[PDB]
Design a protein around this ligand. Structure first.
Ligand SMILES: OC[C@H]1O[C@@H](O)[C@H](O)[C@@H](O)[C@@H]1O
Ligand SMILES: OC[C@H]1O[C@@H](O)[C@H](O)[C@@H](O)[C@@H]1O
Ligand SMILES: OC[C@H]1O[C@@H](O)[C@H](O)[C@@H](O)[C@@H]1O
Ligand SMILES: OC[C@H]1O[C@@H](O)[C@H](O)[C@@H](O)[C@@H]1O
Ligand SMILES: OC[C@H]1O[C@@H](O)[C@H](O)[C@@H](O)[C@@H]1O
Ligand SMILES: OC[C@H]1O[C@@H](O)[C@H](O)[C@@H](O)[C@@H]1O
Lengths: 659, 320, 320
């Protein structure tokens, strides 16, 4: 089970099973332990009021791949198959099931969220017979309980060459905010005259199906494909016609051309890769982290991932600083065009951030704690983070400036970076309060350590305000503009306080409380406001035992690992690397939960932090304040013989590290 | 397990568990293996287009008895209780759960589809402490996925003698055919001045809850009741006001008068009975058959049972 | 009555009374001759078809500050108070009412359209009792006849330090063009453990209220604040959640921090001023003219005033 490219499960156990995801940054499909079914389907960019939080959410969507297979009238079930295996191929995001049905046939099915067609899915089914058999195949479109006012359609699209039978459903999200359309077809090798007749049944209010029979002689292979398109009024004004048009398009492109384009795009993503010699488990784990970030993002868009990507409804599909600080940095180094989409998400929502600032009595752009379609605040009102956790504005500024440092794109800086940096600096200049000593305070926030609520001069928050004001001032200089001199005066006098032991104080009421996650240590990395190696170490020593084992998210130990790598402490760096994600794993595919022993995968934020521990920690790679990627001193774990990181920076550099 | 009047389950196994029903011919409540929860609630006479068959169906309704209990901030779960038992008393259609929570307390809960009040349900919770503890009690009204366009309300009905806190939800069946209202209250022994303060939370689109804290010294019994009314536009033109009116009525009738009337009607049903000597299993089985027919019918109505009565959505609740 | 900064009214006469406005360029609140009430509330930027002209109009909005005060069960009435006075402080747009209830207590109430928070209002109430008394305080959210399809909510927002009780209404303008949300809370000095229990009543289709009792002892002051947020779909896509979020934000900022920011922004406005020596009536009149223009405009926006600013529905709120 240490294949560096494949995650395998023998005999999926439904009593202890956490499905894996295939995704193209638009659709995510989460696996079921049941053969030829999927557990959940999530469409990016589609939000409505639904369950948790009384705010906008991702919506469970059509399980559009669900199929029933029968052999001589006998229904295929978990209980009557043997040698049942599931496998995720991380090279091309193919999820494959395979099983034996009694003495009759071997079945393999592979499905894909097509990498080049954001709204298109395909499953390919292969049946290899050991005896004569007749198969009955049904594809079911069940309207999930999350949707309403469904309509169930079926028609034949014909010409002299084809009969494309379309199984289509149209339905609405809970408040009617979004119309969803799904359209499926079967694709056959044998052509119009010989293909099976397709029947349509509408027997339930919430389910219709298309089906066919096929006789297969012993010792033959019969293959067919299911192609589906899934799209909403959030993506296109006429989703009903666009879904049918897409499925017709995909059917006439054909399986080979679809899979070839899919493969080409996945091959391109994997030109940026991390290779570890001497630790097959670490190699597979790091590949899974890269695979999930690649699956949950999309170049050339304005999409940004939630903390759980497209693996489900975690945190309602909202966008948080989880993107800017956790998932963005490793993507910026490996695939700057992915990072570009992530900051494009914020650029597009700058006006909503300006509106939030004005509603809360500030200047400039105040990015929301949680973002969705509009860019307005989406945090549940019972969470004080929505009203008071302000560092997100500085986190957006830091990511914008880092995008420019890595790419050197001055055209992007003028059009997009500077609008963000100027407006977010104006926010901080309005947010600070000057005290009698001429110092600047940021009073009454929720800390990055969210267990500290309505406190003053949070270390991380104050650090992000310093960086936002500094980076905005540097950006103005690149563009030949005079930044307001107040930005530098404020940045230079924002309070960052020490306790009597010389340790960075987390906030003005902090002595020795347990903390939820890294806060003061984030001043060392990522902010690099703390560079003195003795201060870094004093802060690690005091805070590293302040994070409890229970109910603490994977937003701490990866930072500890990276900081110990930078201190050239191999044993401590490796201890914290393992602790960052191995206690958070769920079977059978080693997906990552939010907290130690958690059961809510896949926490893409966690993967992003660990990938920083590997690339910026073990690999020593760093965003140079002057521009570009540089390498600082680092160590490898004892047991790692070689670390190879490919496709780094705009020059696509390979870095090799050894002992 | 051959009690002629009682069906018992030790350590309900959620991997192999089929819940039992309490019903009054109008509401059926199907048990959950989880403590202080119910799996499904079905209201007779309420049909809309829903799932199977593309025709009218019974609708899964509010699981109106669902409660969360915490002891000194620790949530009661299947995994942290012991000596957990469930029992159906076929004499009076009482479903009872009982368990021990660590070293702190013994809990018993009994619920009823009140035999004389077609639209009223009651659960009575008893906590017997072995150590000082603080309980947190939450009653959740989760709108099931079968209903839409819900509204979640909370208010205090007061006079010089009472504060009746009402937790109310109103929602619609899938096509809008039927408006459903549910209204719950907590009933306390100790009276208006000493009763716990009731908080209301509306944190989700499909769930609101009412809750309270109570300190209980070691070696004490603390009891309270949850009363709910569940009714639709198929039963009354104004279900929202009728549900609140019913729960206020039931709260001011009080637990003793409600249970006494419940008991009297069940006693009358069992005046017609089948007694077998020499086969304790057959005696219990035949009592279960009589109990289900009695629970799934109602004298002095125009109600008729589906093939599955009020045990769920079998055959869409249709009459055959 | 020639104070250069204050407009005062002794014993307001409802038969000849034109209320004054406090406004922040976004919300206008027009005074009532009745104690602890407001006549009209106007939200900028919110237009729908309504009455005059068959064209878009400003809409009368929730009179969100309306309060009933009782001493030992006796409600404050214009017939049982004396020394009743109203004052507009043009330096900070504070509207203050003050009166004596019989021989028992003096009451002052000051309200503000918070200058820095476009969608937030605050009223501070001070009660000084010459004898031991018990006050009952009610805040009413009456849906005005201009709005439809209202919903009336109440909940507690809690953590270990706070219990923020939110009284919320959501309703629609006549054609459904705009969704309005209002959310109110009481802010107490004494802390979560000692603050009064807040009850919620929903007795009418168009009105709900939150209320409390408080014992005050002879020679003591009791002070509390009412904070409200008022916002629409013309200002934010999700006004329901943004109204509750704003009131929670304002509650946790606290009365001192809110008033300090309010005062800072008014002080900045009055750095541009007109001073007349030799004509105190002209000085006061010109200060009123500047006060109204400053109240009916807002820097750093795309807002423009109607001929009547936020003083009411004059010329439908249109810009000319
Ligand atoms: O349908 C798709 C196919 O169309 C043909 O016209 C092309 O020659 C093929 O290269 C292509 O794969
Ligand atoms: O992942 C979403 C959020 O989860 C919370 O547990 C953390 O405290 C936040 O830092 C994080 O943004
Ligand atoms: O979504 C509401 C809140 O959930 C909490 O669990 C997280 O710690 C917050 O970051 C988030 O804002
Ligand atoms: O430790 C986990 C807890 O952290 C808090 O900051 C969040 O508000 C809670 O939602 C969460 O359950
Ligand atoms: O509230 C119900 C109770 O009311 C009293 O007035 C009666 O005396 C009792 O017999 C009855 O049980
Ligand atoms: O709640 C607002 C208050 O927050 C505190 O943390 C600050 O020290 C105060 O200056 C501020 O007024």
């Amino acid at each position: 089970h240490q294949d560096p490219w494949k995650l395998s499960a023998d005999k999926p156990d439904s009593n202890n099973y956490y499905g894996e995801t295939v995704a193209n940054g638009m659709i995510g499909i989460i696996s079921s332990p049941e053969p030829l079914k999927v557990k959940e389907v999530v469409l990016a960019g589609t939000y409505d009021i639904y369950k948790r939080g009384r705010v906008s959410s991702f919506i469970p969507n059509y399980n559009l791949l669900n199929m029933k297979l029968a052999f001589n009238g006998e229904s295929v079930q978990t209980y009557n198959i043997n040698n049942y295996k599931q496998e995720l191929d991380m090279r091309n995001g193919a999820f494959t099931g395979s099983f034996q049905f009694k003495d009759l046939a071997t079945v393999t099915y592979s499905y894909y969220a097509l990498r080049h067609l954001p709204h298109c899915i395909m499953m390919v089914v292969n049946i290899n017979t050991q005896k004569d058999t007749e198969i009955n195949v049904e594809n079911l479109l069940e309207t999930p309980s999350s949707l309403n006012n469904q309509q169930n359609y079926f028609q034949n699209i014909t010409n002299t060459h084809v009969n494309i039978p379309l199984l289509t459903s149209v339905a609405f999200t809970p408040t009617g905010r979004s119309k969803i359309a799904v359209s499926n077809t079967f694709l056959f090798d044998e052509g119009k005259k010989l293909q099976p007749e397709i029947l349509h049944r509408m027997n339930d209010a919430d389910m219709h199906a298309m089906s066919f029979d096929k006789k297969i002689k012993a010792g033959k292979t019969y293959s067919f494909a299911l192609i589906g398109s899934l799209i909403s009024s959030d993506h296109i004004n006429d989703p009903y016609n666009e879904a049918e048009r897409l499925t017709i398009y995909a059917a006439l492109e054909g399986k080979s051309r679809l899979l070839n384009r899919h493969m080409q795009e996945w091959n391109s993503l994997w030109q940026s890769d991390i290779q570890v010699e001497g630790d097959p488990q670490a190699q597979q784990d790091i590949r899974s982290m890269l695979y999930h970030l690649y699956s949950f993002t999309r170049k050339s868009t304005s999409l940004s991932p939630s903390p759980m990507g497209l693996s489900g409804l975690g945190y309602n599909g909202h966008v948080f600083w989880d993107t800017e600080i956790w998932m963005f940095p490793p993507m910026l180094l490996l695939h700057p065009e992915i990072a570009k989409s992530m900051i494009e998400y914020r650029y597009q929502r700058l006006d909503a951030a300006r509106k939030k600032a004005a509603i809360y009595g500030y200047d400039g752009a105040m990015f929301p704690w949680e973002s969705a379609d509009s860019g307005a605040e989406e945090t549940p009102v019972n969470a004080l983070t929505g009203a008071f956790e302000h560092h997100v504005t500085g986190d957006v500024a830091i990511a914008a400036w880092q995008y420019y440092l890595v790419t050197g794109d001055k055209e992007w800086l003028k059009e997009k970076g500077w609008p963000i940096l100027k407006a977010t600096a104006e926010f901080w200049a309005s947010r600070v309060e000057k005290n009698d000593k001429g110092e600047y305070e940021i009073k009454n926030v929720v800390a990055a350590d969210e267990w500290a609520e309505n406190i003053d001069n949070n270390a991380y928050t104050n650090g992000t305000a310093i960086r936002n004001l500094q980076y905005a001032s540097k950006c103005a200089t690149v563009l030949g503009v005079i930044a307001p001199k107040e930005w530098t005066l404020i940045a230079d006098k924002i309070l960052i306080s020490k306790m009597s032991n010389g340790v960075t104080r987390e906030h003005d009421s902090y002595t020795d409380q347990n903390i939820k996650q890294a806060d003061a240590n984030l001043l060392a990395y990522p902010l690099k406001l703390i560079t003195d190696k003795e201060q870094i170490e004093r802060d690690l020593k005091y805070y590293q035992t302040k994070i409890p084992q229970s109910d603490t998210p994977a937003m701490t130990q990866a930072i500890f690992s990276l900081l110990y790598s930078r201190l050239e402490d191999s044993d401590q760096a490796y201890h914290w690397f393992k602790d960052a994600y191995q206690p958070n794993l769920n079977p059978p595919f080693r997906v990552i939960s939010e907290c130690k022993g958690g059961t809510n995968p896949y926490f893409s934020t966690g993967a992003g932090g660990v990938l920083q521990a590997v690339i910026m920690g073990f690999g020593g790679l760093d965003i140079d304040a002057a521009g570009g990627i540089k390498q600082v001193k680092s160590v490898l774990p004892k047991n790692w013989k070689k670390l190879t990181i490919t496709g780094i920076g705009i020059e696509k550099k390979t870095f090799v590290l050894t002992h």
